[model samples]
Target chain A: ADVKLHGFWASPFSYRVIWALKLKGVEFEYIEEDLANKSELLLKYNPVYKQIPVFVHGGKPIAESLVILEYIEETWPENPLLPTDPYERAMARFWIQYGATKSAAFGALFRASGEELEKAAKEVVEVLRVLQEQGLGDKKFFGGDSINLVDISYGLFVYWLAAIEDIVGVKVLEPSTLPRLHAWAQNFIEVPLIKENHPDNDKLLLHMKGVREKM
Target chain B: ADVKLHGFWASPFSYRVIWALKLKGVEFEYIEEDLANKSELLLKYNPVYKQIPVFVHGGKPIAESLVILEYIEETWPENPLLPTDPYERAMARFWIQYGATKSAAFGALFRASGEELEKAAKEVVEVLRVLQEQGLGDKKFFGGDSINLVDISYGLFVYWLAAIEDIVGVKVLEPSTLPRLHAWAQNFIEVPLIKENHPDNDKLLLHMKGVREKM
Candidate 1:
């Protein structure tokens, strides 16, 4: 009966696990955390990263959103987050790995300004084109009919990119540019679980703006 | 009967999957890829990173060493690379994830020169200290009694770092500083599978020298 998640609401990493648990219908007590002043439990639970989204069960803790997601899939097999076949599972992980490589580029986009911002956006978009063309293909979702781990992994950034685009007046995911991913985002939020729990756009914009200024 | 691995001879990433498949007792064709002039098949197999260690099963390909390891464990359940329990599996993944984060620091260490090399080494050692004191503790191996995916994930880099130290005539994994991990490495390479499969120290040193010179 001991299950808990310590996370910051603003973090996409936290929501990744949060959405997974919800989709699986696994109940757990979620402890919201402050990034500015983190709780000691977080530091203790995840001395390695000391970051948020630590999933604790029976006193044992698991950090890293991807690791947590895998744990959840294994522990609760109902409404599986991953495919049943090993080959398909590898494909799921393959896309997820690709998604992570873009985080640095996304961070640069978040922190850059003026000409630097445009340059960072261009680099990020270049890969986005690849993901859209090669990875997504003609699928309504990366998971075909429904959302899978790949969607959850990529979903957070798609929304955040939208928020960043709104706040900075920059258009990285322009419909004409990434028409497929643009449509994919529409289908992603259409799912009740993703939309209801997604961070508020207005608040996320303000938060992104604040974090960017400091950097 | 349709399984193949396209990889380079010297890459630790390639060796990672090699060791995994051999440990699992899986029969497959091993295609040694040349990094200098990559094959069309290699590019077709892994377009995302366009790197080595691409595992193809029944013609479908999976890139990224860590992703390939997971796929191997799932494909062949015998001689398990990861623990059966979800919590233990999560722990294995947690350490592997921790290892991945240090890759950039290791890259910096590889590319730095003189004063910069010493500075990079210091930063790498700081985390190695944490990995030693926290992760390894008193265990003979990270996998406790025997090697697991955590060992494989971290093992390559550990050997590479040692080769780098020997090449540069600097010491990062000094026994006095990291007694636990120093002993752990001894236990790691002692396993006939690991030792037989591991890259040659003299050749690795020479290779590291060549690459570092290029950098």
Candidate 2:
């Protein structure tokens, strides 16, 4: 099976597919896309969204990061990302959906000023609290012992969020504030596959600063 | 297997689960929830959201309508809600997520006034156009020949949207504007199971008027 992934370097969405493929031990060709000037292939592959990461398996394209992850899990059930049990899988998916829903809160925090920034920061903290209290609890990972799709789904929080925090000069993910989530962030990136594959911290910080400046 | 659903009468989110269960021929007990005066069981079953339709199968509770639909499909493979092929399933999910992401647009149309109403209506038309052009294409249903989870996910558009259109006195889904989508909506609601299981039109319109008055 020929697996080709068209992705942007700084996209957490793209990284999601990359991490899932690595976890499953599936080999794929990576095509780095320039978001400013998008390729004809990407436009052809995902005409609906016209975005990456577009995963093409034997010439068939699939868009949306989480949806693609599910495809990979179902097609190759070797090292499963989701729970085997139906109820448990549903629970995992609930949290994943929760993250997607609350993403605007994180984005609000990233781009806000004065009173708006304070309100956005508060919202971000509240969202994290709900995630910690209800979603994460005291589990070593979202999948209990190992990093699952739930953990991978929140992979952006580990690096991308930190970069945003740095650029904004504020920290919502403090150890005292969100102890378990704070720890989970630390542990998530340390995973060999994730740690090695992630974009350089220095470069990301520079990129995020430029983005913030433009905003 | 004892299947139970806690839901509100006028909630399209709740109806998504209802339609899926009835389509699957899964016999389940229905418990009508009063959102104004909350139920202890609803709170207990879904501590996080405290919303319905919460589907309980043999005492195990699963919240989130889409998640519950997936669970029902997995648990009972007799009448499949989603496509069996992984790629096809991914495509189905992509459109489902698209509907969810664009929900705020629909809500905006429901609540807007004056100039805002004009703008919101335009936005709603654009969203529907995209769904018709990119998502649905020439398929009889979003799932091609028959209704699938993707079709069920947007079941709200078939009834709830029409209710909103009546309340607002603006018709964006006119046959001349969106011929394919208009036809699809008609074909969808006319399905025997969906037609039988839906909420009372008179009652729903009355409830929606009350909701609009409050807003």
Candidate 3:
């Protein structure tokens, strides 16, 4: 049976799975899901999580983006998206979990204003600073030489984060401020696979504007 | 070199690591930390996360309790804390990730009040419903008969959740309401390793009271 991926085009979660598959050279069908009106297959596949991207392989469904990334890595352990060393892999997974954990506060900052916005921004900075100091640590990318799972996991920051910055008018990843992280982002985007795969910048910015207005 | 665990006594994160180590039959040196003034070793071990249950083996520190669990399982692939099948392992990891993602909202509900508290409680219910329907299902434990990493990952809910319910005067988990989850919680705590290692309910209640007061 063929593998199928149900996901939204703009979702960072979907991109995580896509990047892992591309890195591992796995061939699969990509189905664009309208999250607002989810397809019957999406519902049937991920009955509980009910979110994209759900990876269906050999007629079995797997939901949750991080879990999908791990499954792809295991099912096709060709290119080795995660570090071979167990410790390094653990560290990478930790940072990915951190990103997933802090997403709500980041989203809150994008939607909030005045003191509320500032509070959420502060929380976001605290989390980002932790990533900068601990996770990145002068590395060109989280993957070191080539983009790995961690880099792919945080790919949203490279594209959507900047669009978010434009909409919110608050720059958290400034070169002068978080210089290391800023450079890491640039280096990460320079990778051919990532550079080719990322969503269009202007379109993302337009989308961010609409999202922010609604928020 | 032997395995060293850096953790605080009362921290649920620490307990999760302990449960995994015990289940895997891995001997470790547990170093209790003072959270008010964290040790330098804790900082050095977990520079980025700066939170504990850092597992150090052969001088390498793996931070984040969940990631550490994965590392421990891989490094000492004996009792198989994770499922043997790749997809089953992915399912276990997915639920753990799901729990990690929803943890913040669960805590927010504990400290929230009035309509805000109700909203937070609703979020917690949504998360629990997903956990019950998607993760637990018909399994005696998340790993089937014996407890696994999935059970350990959400170990906090056993007693701590009950304490929070008592303090908040809201019963979040009931067998009639969430039969599978309630059964799973009971089954989880009955495990010898987990039953013996959990915090004292009386003290946890006192602690919960203090936490509610502060919030």
Candidate 4:
């Protein structure tokens, strides 16, 4: 039996798995979940979090997006996504984790208003600046020459972020302000695998515009 | 050359590395940081965050306490802190990641008052109850039958929590409310390696009391 993945198409977390699996050349069945009415299998497979993408290998379940990515790297070590050196491995994990934790401020900025929005925006810039200077310093991609797990894990920043920027009309990843990271977004999409798999930019812009309009 | 750890004595993050090293019977040189005047090396090694418990192996730096735990586990596989199976390893990483993400709620609950405190407290309970019911279940410790990286990662709950409970005069991890988790907490501290390595209870109580009084 082949490995199975349950995911929602638009979720950045789900896209993380898709990129990792495709990068590693792992064969799997993808089951898209409806967020309005999630699948019973998704809930059962990942009872603790009750979220996806849930990876079922040989009938055993592994939930949580980052954990699933690590599992994919370990289980299929070919076309390696993570670094082999322990220190480098830790650095990859650190930045991936940093992205996951810091994304909260970005979400807050999207949802908040007035001084609250300003506070959230400032916090988001501080985090992005840190990522640019400290995390992505002098590297072509976060992994240097080639894209690694860190790049795949942060794929949302490339495609979806551009859409958000266009919709909001306030660029969070401006080239003049963050030249390297701005370059990373362009470099990231140029990769054939990522370019092919990402959500349509126009559609993403419309969706984000709709979300802001509703708010 | 000894494995040198730059850390603050009282930090739970520092204790994570110390506990992992002790559990694996690895020897290391411990350098206590003066918080009032942190060492230049500590600042340089961890310039992005400038946080403690920077593990320097062969003069290379690795920051983030949980990531350091992963580094140590991979470097020294004996008496493994993480599970051998890929799925279980994912589970271990999942809980650690959850703790990292939800720390804001825990931190806020410790300081906030009125509706804000209530909101923070509610979030903290939601996380803790999920941990109790979904994460721990019937396990003696988070690792089952012994302390693992998760137990070490949550070192704050052993002493710091007790301090928080005393200061707030509120009890959450009660036998009546969360029997399994309450039992697990008891069993967790009783482990020989952990029992020996933790902070003095009286000192922790005093420190937490100071934190609460200031708030």
Candidate 5:
């Protein structure tokens, strides 16, 4: 295959590339990297972060999930992950950047304990509120009607977040808190490509539980 | 002018857009925003963050300096800020994202005092080391020969960071410590467009001193 994806099972970042490739109807090899024991190839490909979801096209490698997504979009422009209009593209990117910046806040919620967890949960709720009120609003998806990079950018929040909530025994994505965003999550996962390509739910929950215990 | 930039005088984020606009040879109306007493326009334009460096093209508003830089590049492709090659573009963005993520560490260095200041300074040195070793390597600029969005993204570190080090009484960008990165900073500021468009050094030192005192 001309394209190859280095990723880990149960990683939302890895799943991002999977969904984009599937959506674009692109063919590639999947090389799963062990987080505990990272491969030399992974290290050489991404020396800075040494993290998974490194997308390789031909011989060149690209790190960072968001950057990889943009590369995929540009490489395979037929599927069109981002909007054509400059203003709309900027808006999509703005929301995507927002999610990236606030990822630590969500991770804090996942990793927190007792009082810290409560504070983290509150922070996450505020983040979701802003995302729902200002970002999503009344739209069916962040991109409105159809899923775009914005929708895909929040891919982790659908499954991984649910698993985190389940393992941590915290509920933040309830329908009452964020009705539109909650509904949007369901709709996002239900998309034919995404639903088919996601990691196994039980296995993911188990993996997350192990990881959380280590934390 | 069709392009209006909502920015503060001493903000590096604002300068990112200003440099890009000037590089692209696009004219714009500069709207100086008061950080302490923000304008209603700034609030209306960027309600979520209510921050400066908001770029308004035509009538649509875009927040986030990085996002705005990409928008400017896409809208005005005359003098390109980003590389045309997809992989190179991804590489540029990865470094930009790296800087953005580590910005807090840099800021912590500026705000730290006593033992905390020593610790923050250590953290900043590590960041610069990675940036020089992995990100910049032997290149004259982050974008090779000429300045690109990556160089512009770190525009703050060039002048603003020097001003910060002066005010804080701790130096991280010294030639002996970070030779390549230090040289790149000097080269970055020497560019005619950048040299002419930057904030006054003495005034910047005063603003940074005020900010540090508040911290």
Candidate 6:
């Protein structure tokens, strides 16, 4: 296979790869992997975690969505996803990696209940507060002007975070509090490539609601 | 300053950057940051985490050791710390990222006691077993013949793991069970660049012991 993405349709991780490929104008065969029963090939491709969003290229498998993103950027350098300067690239990567490192706080808001929910919300709020202050600042986008992998890495705020907030009837990216980051979120998803390519908004809302109900 | 490093002397994170700079033949001034009483510059440099191993290039701060490592690799492309091939680079990034994700297990092995300690060891054992089996296999090194960022990223097993195991009086990198990975640790520390540049073993051993005593 030239390029095959084994992923779930509604996954943020999967969408990260999808959006990048579409932006790069790289055609890829989308294979929606079953969350319950992953394919033998899928399991074989990512034996370490046996997870989805496995980017297969020329019969080689690259797992981890972030790593896959890097591979895509490196392999297809047509549409630059990262900045040119090494220092700028480092800054981009620091925030992208920050999205991952601070993910547990985000999960807490999703899974916690009552008092714990409020506390979890505080933790995630503080994370975003610093993110808006230090990581984003007054920049129009994390990448500034146009979206980069840093923006893609924080795509959680665009969809999943929105869906989670909708389901819980609470908002983390308070427009008044984090106006710049909030505007960035609104603008990020509106990017021609990102705007057109994403999971069904209604479906993701229901999917997240389904998840919370089950939890 | 052209280049600067804000770090603790005995830190693996600091060493990751230190080793990279040395390997690249890039001269840098190292400013040891006091963990207890961090300097105002260190505080301002890494406001989010305020942790050490911040790499400064042309006065711009880049926090997180892994990010700094990537910065080092990109800025100085001479020694070639990572693979040239895109897929190979993906594989290198995967294992490097894997170390951070599975770090809680490593911490468990360090901080637990009695039954918890046994459970912790098993968790870490499984992680290393997968790492040994899927990541390293029979390769002389993770980088295969030369040390890459993947190998450097895993500088953990070389010093920290050894110190933790010694302090606990328990062995995790059993030569019989994880022969390849064990061989890696042996060969890794012996690398000329790494061997000469490391924290004094006696001081580190005492440092770790002192850490456990406070527990």
* Model 2 misplacement above 4 A: none
What is the alpha-carbon lDDT of model 5 when measured against the actual structure? 0.87
- TM-score each candidate: 0.96, 0.96, 0.90, 0.93, 0.95, 0.97
DockQ list for all candidates: 0.88, 0.87, 0.74, 0.82, 0.90, 0.95
The predicted structure with the larger lDDT, 1 or 2, is 2
Can you write out model 4's per-residue Cα lDDT over B44-137, one digit (the tens) per residue?
8998788898999999898888889999998999998889878788888888877776666666767766557667666777778998877888
Residue-level lDDT tens digits of model 2 in B44-133: 999888888899999989999888989988898887878898988988999999988888887788888777988888888998999999
Which pairs clash in model 5? none
Fraction of native contacts under 8 Å reproduced by each candidate: 0.97, 0.94, 0.94, 1.00, 0.97, 1.00
After superposing candidate 3, which stretches have Cα over 4 Å from the reference? A112-129, A165-169, B112-126, B165-169
In candidate 1, list every pair of residues with a backbone clash. none
Identify the leading candidate in terms of TM-score. 6
Ranking according to DockQ, highest score first: 6, 5, 1, 2, 4, 3
Model 5: residues with Cα > 4 Å off, grouped in runs:
none
Q: Give iRMSD, candidate 6.
A: 0.5
* Worst-scoring 10-residue span by lDDT in model 2 chain A: A156-165
Error of 1 at A63 (Å): 1.2
Shift of residue A118 alpha carbon in model 6, Å: 1.5
User: Distance (Å) between predicted and true CA of B11, model 3?
Assistant: 1.9
Q: What's the lDDT for residue B9 in model 3?
A: 67
Considering TM-score, which of the candidate structures 5 and 6 is the better prediction for this target? 6
Each prediction's Cα lDDT score?
A: 0.85, 0.87, 0.82, 0.80, 0.87, 0.87
Off by over 4 Å in 6: none
Please provide, for model 6 over B6-101, each residue's C-alpha lDDT reduced to its tens digit, 9 standing for 90 to 100.
999889989999999999999999999999999999999998898998888888999999999998998899989888999888888999999988
- Tell me the spans in candidate 1 whose CA falls farther than 4 Å from its real position: none
